[PDB]
Amino acid sequence: MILVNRETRVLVQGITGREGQFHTKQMLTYGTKIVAGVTPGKGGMEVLGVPVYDTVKEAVAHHEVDASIIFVPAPAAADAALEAAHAGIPLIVLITEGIPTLDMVRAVEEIKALGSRLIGGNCPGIISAEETKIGIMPGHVFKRGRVGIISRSGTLTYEAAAALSQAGLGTTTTVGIGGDPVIGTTFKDLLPLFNEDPETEAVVLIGEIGGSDEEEAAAWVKDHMKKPVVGFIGGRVGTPESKLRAFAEAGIPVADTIDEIVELVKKALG
């Protein structure tokens, strides 16, 4: 696994909202160690046994936190991420969709400078199979195994994870990094972590049109990866052709279908 596991202590920002409450319940049931929640104006309340505070600073003053997950409304979501970073929280998972691009870029830059890792926004989060769940992904399709996943598409991530689980390969950590133009963590940032994780025997990269992250990741894989990588591009620099060419030139086998992801991983591991 990379980044998080069962021991990861989690803070939920926007815990009192409909989404926040629903997923706090799903995560608690999964085994995620949610230790506190934050919602301005709701400090003093309790959600599913989780104490709620008005600010992240107040929450961290009473609880050690390794990561935070944000369900705060779009207009204030970027600030919520910044609030977590200023409090010293190492990992910040920003779920919220619709955050203004300008807000997003400013948050990415400042949080990066502060030393925290930001996943998102507009993403499903991170899950370490049968260890911990810090996101909104369907937990049941992530059976524990040996394949790591980094994906810009939640849709394809779940199809791939379910297929890998059914094939007996399973998964380690899956990070849904988000498909929007501006994201805080991408392929190249996570590949080195998977490369050094002995539990991960192969990594699946799921990309799509736009940006240059897939192309940059391919170059990194070609020069530094020590284990198999399989790629998939949805919607079949910045074009699908450019990304397919980049993967091909990097020696990264590309699956044309979800089933081929499974077949290519099996082939690579022998």
Which structure tokens are listed for 265? Answer: 């991983």
Contact 6, 132 (CB under 8 A): yes
Q: Comparing C-alpha atoms, which of 14, 13, 152, 22 is closest to residue 85?
A: 13
What residues pair up with 233 in beta bridges, in sequence order? 207
- What is the per-residue DSSP string for 87-137? TT-SEEEE--S---HHHHHHHHHHHHHHT-EEEESSS-EEEETTTEEEESS
**CA pair distance 251, 223, nearest whole angstrom:** 11
Tell me where in the chain the CATH 3.40.50.261 domain(s) lie: 123-269
**CA pair distance 135, 142, nearest whole angstrom:** 13
Which structure tokens are listed for 117? Answer: 């890792």
**CA pair distance 161, 103, nearest whole angstrom:** 32
Q: Comparing C-alpha atoms, which of 258, 247, 236 is closest to residue 213?
A: 247
Between the CA of residue 167 and those of 37, 160, 182, 198, what are the distances in Å?
38, 10, 34, 21
**CA pair distance 16, 9, nearest whole angstrom:** 19
- What is the per-residue DSSP string for 182-230? --SS-HHHHHHHHHT-TT--EEEEEE-SSSSHHHHHHHHHHHH--S-EE
Query: Cα-flanking dihedrals φ and ψ of residue 177, to 5°?
Result: -80, -10
One-letter amino acid of 241 = E
Q: Comparing C-alpha atoms, which of 116, 76, 117, 126 is closest to residue 96?
A: 76
What residues pair up with 53 in beta bridges, in sequence order? 38
CATH of domain 1-122: 3.40.50.720
Which string of b and e fits 225-234 if b means at least 16 CB within 10 Å? bebbbbbbbe
Contact 95, 114 (CB under 8 A): no
**DSSP secondary-structure letter at 139?**
G
**CA pair distance 77, 253, nearest whole angstrom:** 37
Q: How far is C-alpha 179 from the chain's CA centre?
A: 11
Residue 19 DSSP SS3: helix
Residue given tokens 């977590």 in the structure block: 84
| Binding residue ranges | 16-19, 42, 95-97, 158
| Half-sphere exposure in the Cβ direction for 247 (13 Å, CA) | 24
| Binding residue ranges for substrate | 158
Q: Comparing C-alpha atoms, which of 118, 145, 131, 158 is closest to residue 258?
A: 158
Residue given tokens 């380690």 in the structure block: 172
Tell me where in the chain the CATH 3.40.50.720 domain(s) lie: 1-122
Cβ-based neighbours of 162, under 8 Å, separated by 6 or more:
141
Which structure tokens are listed for 141? Answer: 């399709």
| Binding residue ranges for CoA | 16-19, 42, 95-97
Cβ-based neighbours of 50, under 8 Å, separated by 6 or more:
12, 15, 24, 28, 34, 35, 36, 37
Neighbours of 115 (CB within 10 A): 9
What residues pair up with 119 in beta bridges, in sequence order? 93
Cβ-based neighbours of 132, under 8 Å, separated by 6 or more:
4, 5, 6, 7, 8, 10, 30, 31, 32, 33
- CATH fourth-level superfamily of 123-269: Succinyl-CoA synthetase domains (3.40.50.261)
CA dihedral 259, 263, 268, 270 (to 10 degrees): 150
Contact 93, 126 (CB under 8 A): yes
Contact 159, 207 (CB under 8 A): no
Q: Specify the resolution in Å.
A: 1.2
